[PDB]
Design an enzyme around this catalytic site. Structure first.
Site, PDB file in Angstrom:
ATOM      1  N   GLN A 291      18.769   1.386 -39.405  1.00 19.56           N
ATOM      2  CA  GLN A 291      17.483   1.531 -39.060  1.00 19.56           C
ATOM      3  C   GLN A 291      16.760   0.636 -38.498  1.00 19.56           C
ATOM      4  O   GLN A 291      16.809  -0.372 -39.408  1.00 19.56           O
ATOM      5  CB  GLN A 291      16.635   2.788 -39.824  1.00 19.56           C
TER       6      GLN A 291
ATOM      7  N   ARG B 284      10.932   8.871 -43.935  1.00 19.85           N
ATOM      8  CA  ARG B 284      10.124   9.470 -45.221  1.00 19.85           C
ATOM      9  C   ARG B 284       9.396   8.433 -45.932  1.00 19.85           C
ATOM     10  O   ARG B 284       9.940   7.482 -46.247  1.00 19.85           O
ATOM     11  CB  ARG B 284      10.920  10.363 -45.843  1.00 19.85           C
TER      12      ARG B 284
ATOM     13  N   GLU C 237      15.996  17.582 -47.495  1.00 11.25           N
ATOM     14  CA  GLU C 237      16.374  16.905 -46.431  1.00 11.25           C
ATOM     15  C   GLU C 237      17.049  17.846 -45.292  1.00 11.25           C
ATOM     16  O   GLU C 237      17.236  19.014 -45.343  1.00 11.25           O
ATOM     17  CB  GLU C 237      17.136  15.939 -46.702  1.00 11.25           C
TER      18      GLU C 237
ATOM     19  N   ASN D  45       8.506  -2.239 -33.398  1.00  8.25           N
ATOM     20  CA  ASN D  45       9.266  -0.906 -33.432  1.00  8.25           C
ATOM     21  C   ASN D  45       8.504   0.158 -34.073  1.00  8.25           C
ATOM     22  O   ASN D  45       7.467  -0.006 -35.020  1.00  8.25           O
ATOM     23  CB  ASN D  45      10.488  -1.215 -34.741  1.00  8.25           C
TER      24      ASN D  45
HETATM   25  C1  LIG Z   1      10.804  14.951 -39.113  1.00  7.48           C
HETATM   26  C2  LIG Z   1      11.847  13.573 -38.809  1.00  7.48           C
HETATM   27  C3  LIG Z   1      11.986  12.926 -40.072  1.00  7.48           C
HETATM   28  C4  LIG Z   1      12.782  11.768 -40.283  1.00  7.48           C
HETATM   29  N1  LIG Z   1      13.241  11.235 -41.390  1.00  7.48           N
HETATM   30  C5  LIG Z   1      13.897   9.933 -41.463  1.00  7.48           C
HETATM   31  C6  LIG Z   1      14.035   9.135 -42.849  1.00  7.48           C
HETATM   32  O1  LIG Z   1      13.386   9.709 -43.629  1.00  7.48           O
HETATM   33  N2  LIG Z   1      14.611   8.107 -42.424  1.00  7.48           N
HETATM   34  C7  LIG Z   1      15.245   7.757 -41.315  1.00  7.48           C
HETATM   35  O2  LIG Z   1      16.056   6.485 -41.492  1.00  7.48           O
HETATM   36  N3  LIG Z   1      15.008   8.194 -40.263  1.00  7.48           N
HETATM   37  C8  LIG Z   1      14.390   9.260 -40.302  1.00  7.48           C
HETATM   38  N4  LIG Z   1      14.236  10.345 -39.282  1.00  7.48           N
HETATM   39  C9  LIG Z   1      14.879   9.653 -37.951  1.00  7.48           C
HETATM   40  C10 LIG Z   1      14.482   8.438 -37.228  1.00  7.48           C
HETATM   41  O3  LIG Z   1      13.360   8.704 -36.777  1.00  7.48           O
HETATM   42  C11 LIG Z   1      15.490   8.165 -36.146  1.00  7.48           C
HETATM   43  O4  LIG Z   1      16.828   7.688 -36.672  1.00  7.48           O
HETATM   44  C12 LIG Z   1      14.958   6.924 -35.288  1.00  7.48           C
HETATM   45  O5  LIG Z   1      16.077   6.722 -34.345  1.00  7.48           O
HETATM   46  C13 LIG Z   1      14.587   5.852 -35.984  1.00  7.48           C
HETATM   47  O6  LIG Z   1      13.925   5.035 -35.115  1.00  7.48           O
HETATM   48  P1  LIG Z   1      14.660   3.505 -34.727  1.00  7.48           P
HETATM   49  O7  LIG Z   1      15.821   3.798 -33.811  1.00  7.48           O
HETATM   50  O8  LIG Z   1      13.597   2.579 -34.076  1.00  7.48           O
HETATM   51  O9  LIG Z   1      15.156   2.855 -36.112  1.00  7.48           O
HETATM   52  C14 LIG Z   1      13.495  11.386 -38.907  1.00  7.48           C
HETATM   53  C15 LIG Z   1      13.148  11.896 -37.680  1.00  7.48           C
HETATM   54  C16 LIG Z   1      12.335  13.121 -37.790  1.00  7.48           C
HETATM   55  C17 LIG Z   1      12.077  13.903 -36.403  1.00  7.48           C
HETATM   56  O1  LIG Z   2      15.803   9.425 -46.191  1.00  5.03           O
HETATM   57  C1  LIG Z   2      16.247  10.978 -45.285  1.00  5.03           C
HETATM   58  O2  LIG Z   2      15.889  12.055 -45.942  1.00  5.03           O
HETATM   59  C2  LIG Z   2      16.703  10.915 -43.951  1.00  5.03           C
HETATM   60  C3  LIG Z   2      16.600  11.963 -42.783  1.00  5.03           C
HETATM   61  C4  LIG Z   2      16.834  11.909 -41.702  1.00  5.03           C
HETATM   62  C5  LIG Z   2      17.559  10.808 -41.168  1.00  5.03           C
HETATM   63  C6  LIG Z   2      17.988  10.620 -39.973  1.00  5.03           C
HETATM   64  C7  LIG Z   2      18.621   9.233 -39.470  1.00  5.03           C
HETATM   65  C8  LIG Z   2      18.903   8.250 -40.426  1.00  5.03           C
HETATM   66  C9  LIG Z   2      18.232   8.388 -41.624  1.00  5.03           C
HETATM   67  C10 LIG Z   2      17.742   9.558 -42.212  1.00  5.03           C
HETATM   68  C11 LIG Z   2      17.365   9.764 -43.745  1.00  5.03           C
HETATM   69  K   LIG Z   3      12.565   4.893 -32.495  1.00  5.47           K
HETATM   70 MN   LIG Z   4      13.550   1.147 -32.518  1.00  5.48          MN
END
Ligand SMILES: Cc1cc2nc3c(=O)[nH]c(=O)nc-3n(C[C@H](O)[C@H](O)[C@H](O)COP(=O)(O)O)c2cc1C
Ligand SMILES: O=C(O)c1ccc2ccccc2c1
Ligand SMILES: [K+]
Ligand SMILES: [Mn+2]
Ligand SMILES: Cc1cc2nc3c(=O)[nH]c(=O)nc-3n(C[C@H](O)[C@H](O)[C@H](O)COP(=O)(O)O)c2cc1C
Ligand SMILES: O=C(O)c1ccc2ccccc2c1
Ligand SMILES: [K+]
Ligand SMILES: [K+]
Ligand SMILES: [K+]
Ligand SMILES: [Mn+2]
Lengths: 496, 496
Positions: A187, A170, A279, A165
């Protein structure tokens, strides 16, 4: 190597596009770089490249802010995103999201292992680096730490090796050799962590690669399905096998042109203080510190003149809106179609702080379903809100064929005029909720459950016989010949 | 005579402001004038003055479109409205609404009767005019008639003579000497009609004055209280007694400088086909013809070179938004304060198609109330939705001190991030609803009842100890000295 496959080439593409400002005078990573970046995002200005960061030691590091933010012009509004994907800079959001979905019915193209790459130009072992001594930015004045990780790629693999994956989540510096960060359900980094914790044998082998191939950071931000290896999906999307190199201290593989690579482990037992953080919804709750996952860093490798990408996230418009919202909406569109729902298009309106998704309905197909608002609302919400792709989305807005869901003004118009509050809505209290939305985690109700709604902005006859109105607008309330006369005589009459 | 007290002077003020385009070539009242006007409203262009209308006979008539629509610049966005009121063209919406509310705690200044005025320059009796032979506009291609009345003032008086009401309500030509129009509860024209119908003796003496004093057409669009004579309220607001002249065929009084005056009766018995009409929410339902009130016209008087004002209403932004929404919101603000609710400001966001009102709360006072969201929501909704001032408004959004309710972006941000769907809302199904909203009159539920909601976008600590967040924006997430440095160095670094 092409801009979509190499971060260094993507920075050069932004320069050539006149979509970059190179700041060669000293800039403070303590707030100043993120303040400049924040102002950029609020004004759709050029991306800032900080070539002279106070505290940069031995090539670590420069910063690129606003890598996926908007341009000022309507004509190339999404040009930075298009530069992630080899698309023309004039690409529409529909074209960007169709490119991101194109791999969903292709065979994966697995990655190619190469023996070395630019990410190995420099290395620092466990006795040579101190994450507190790097120019890690303080992004917002009340953040609980220096958030090194806003736009890098976490790499973790299932214990059985069948799923690797790539995702953004963050993380902030905890001490000289640890980060803390959010690892939350549903996630994929959390799903994989759970697999290692139930095996119970070891901490999760991990790497975090910054300045990865742009097409790879887009997939990293997209909720492609459970068990799908993002490397093979990016391969299929780009028609090219991604070149990866093995980590030095573990058997994971990182993009060969990664600007900066951290190698180490994600603990199956330890936590540490994490947040608060400014956020995506536009908020920070100062002193709101929780416990987060704890990462141990064993090695850093990096490119000569390494560039760290940074999202200064918060109020409109940054990568948390343009990528999180839009890429969730694309996966929702596909998920609805796979569930035989007559959805043509989906978009998360920026005006909703990307907490809504507008779903455009093919109403000819809807009519053939011989259904009702309550029934259809319930079916769409059950599909989307019980799936991971719907996690961040708390309101769905169903609209007919006349609405362009990519135009927030038209979504708000439809929502405001065609959805009767209460009667045309169905609330969902027994679904997973997104706690980062202030009305969830800092609200009146359960932080992790409910607070979702399907709002039906389809009019009654859209389910039966067909649209029964014309808009009272220039387009629909005047015949073609008249409209063209008016437009042809507009400057002659005296207008602007 | 000043622009706020004389429509002819107001047209000259728009010219001098470079906020007018005089179209001196022939324009068709069949759709063309309204199409030009519609395009103006959709693009915030200059107001069109049609000096050469195909079918203008014996001085009847020229048309001014978009008399209360927006200007392109942010600096004088509301300048047309300011020109209705003797305010600087740079006036804020708060300043416009405070001017419109200023008469609410002043003694009325009754009108002054004068023996003649410009509105008597010409007359046509019951043998000399034919309303079907005047250049009455067809405003939208599917309208059910030619809507002579979009921006004139109906004048009716209570049977006992103690209340004379001035209001706007649509009307179209029915035949040579009759109009039909909407007279619906709870409007004052309807309240007064009911008084005459219960007396049962005669039809309602009536006049309809077009091109009245701008300050008078603003009050005509405002829900000032039951039993209050708009003439005396405009007198107090302007500090000047309005000059009125008696009608020739009845004992009502019209503004002396009225461009065009119809005299006659509003029937207590007859109805006729009315509508459909392209309306404020942006819709027409073609062939949706209902029965409307029927007006008989006995006489027309008018100014030399008379000018008919016209609203080409529909999608954003026209007089149905800038005046209906904003003036309802002003009266709601006052109504809340009179009911001891800690409301500082109210505005109907244009993005909601003026179906929402955002209410800014003084949260220091809220905290002293020691109350809860459910309780406070219920109290605000009971006050507003059981009053006439709340009629057109289906959603109320409660926001704290940090939100500028005059900024739709900030309302949408607060609504989207601080109000949990369902839990933070209270629905109101036993209140009068506004049937013109498509989800009401053409929706799934009762056309005239319910479909209202109070949405609480106050956060939990706003009721207790105080705001507990900072915005993740440039303004709030960086210290002052840093923000100013960034702004001072912005063009030096290379930004726009
Ligand atoms: C700038 C940015 C910040 C992000 N911060 C977070 C975060 O802190 N935690 C989180 O779970 N997803 C965060 N995301 C979103 C995930 O990348 C998104 O939900 C993605 O689908 C996660 O990958 P997965 O589907 O393989 O779990 C962020 C995306 C961007 C573009
Ligand atoms: O730990 C966050 O600030 C954050 C930001 C965007 C996010 C987007 C999808 C899932 C979790 C997320 C968590
Ligand atoms: K992804
Ligand atoms: Mn994935
Ligand atoms: C361009 C325009 C069109 C209007 N059309 C109507 C209408 O057709 N019917 C209506 O009842 N009110 C209409 N209104 C709104 C009323 O003027 C408003 O509700 C006012 O408060 C009525 O006066 P009253 O409070 O004395 O009844 C219109 C206002 C404007 C600015
Ligand atoms: O008969 C309408 O088109 C209409 C337009 C705006 C209106 C505003 C308040 C009350 C009634 C209304 C009716
Ligand atoms: K509906
Ligand atoms: K009025
Ligand atoms: K709330
Ligand atoms: Mn009145």
């Amino acid at each position: 190597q092409p801009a979509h496959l190499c971060f260094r080439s993507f920075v050069e593409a932004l320069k050539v596009d006149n979509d970059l400002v190179e700041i060669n005078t000293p800039i403070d990573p303590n707030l100043e770089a993120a303040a400049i970046t924040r102002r950029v995002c609020e004004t759709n200005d050029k991306a800032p490249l900080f070539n002279n960061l106070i505290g940069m030691k031995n090539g670590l590091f420069r910063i690129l802010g606003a890598p996926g933010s908007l341009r000022k012009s309507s004509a190339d509004r999404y040009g930075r995103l298009a530069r992630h994907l080899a698309l023309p800079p004039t690409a529409s959001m529909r074209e960007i999201l169709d490119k991101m979905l194109s791999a969903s019915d292709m065979p994966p193209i697995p990655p190619t292992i190469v023996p070395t790459g630019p990410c190995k130009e420099n290395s620092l072992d466990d006795s040579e680096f101190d994450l507190t001594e790097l120019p890690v930015p303080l992004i917002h004045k009340s953040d609980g730490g220096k958030y090194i990780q806003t736009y890098g790629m976490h790499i973790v693999q299932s214990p059985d090796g069948t799923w690797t994956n790539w995702s953004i989540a963050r993380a902030m510096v905890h001490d000289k050799n640890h980060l803390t960060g959010l690892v939350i359900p549903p996630q994929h980094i959390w799903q994989i962590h759970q697999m290692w914790k139930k095996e119970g044998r070891s901490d999760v082998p991990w790497a975090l690669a910054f300045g990865v191939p742009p097409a790879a950071i887009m997939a990293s931000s997209m909720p492609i399905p459970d068990g799908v290896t993002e490397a093979g999906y990016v391969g299929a999307m780009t028609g090219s096998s991604l070149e990866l190199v093995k980590c030095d201290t573990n058997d994971l593989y990182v993009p060969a042109t990664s600007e900066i690579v951290l190698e180490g482990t994600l603990s199956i037992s330890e936590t540490g203080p994490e947040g608060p953080f400014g956020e995506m919804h536009g908020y920070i709750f100062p002193g709101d510190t929780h416990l987060g996952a704890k990462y141990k860093v064993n090695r850093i490798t990096y490119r000569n003149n390494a560039i760290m990408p940074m999202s200064s996230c918060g109020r409109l418009t940054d990568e948390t809106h343009t990528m999180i919202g839009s890429l969730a909406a694309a996966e929702i569109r596909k998920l609805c179609q796979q569930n035989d729902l007559p959805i043509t298009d989906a978009f998360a309106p920026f005006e909703s702080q990307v907490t809504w998704v507008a779903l455009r309905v093919d109403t000819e197909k809807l009519r053939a379903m011989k259904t009702t608002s309550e029934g259809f609302r319930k079916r769409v919400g059950d599909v989307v809100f019980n799936h991971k792709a719907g996690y961040t989305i708390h309101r769905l807005v169903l609209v007919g064929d006349d609405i362009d869901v990519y135009e927030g003004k038209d979504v708000l118009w439809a929502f405001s005029t065609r959805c009767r509050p209460g009667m045309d809505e169905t609330l969902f209290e027994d679904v997973r909720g997104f706690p980062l939305i202030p009305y969830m985690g800092h609200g009146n109700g359960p932080a992790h459950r409910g607070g979702k709604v399907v709002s039906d902005a389809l009019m009654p006859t859209e389910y039966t016989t067909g649209r029964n109105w014309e808009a009272a607008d220039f387009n629909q309330s005047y015949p073609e010949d008249l409209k063209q006369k008016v437009l042809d005589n507009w400057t002659k009459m005296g207008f602007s």
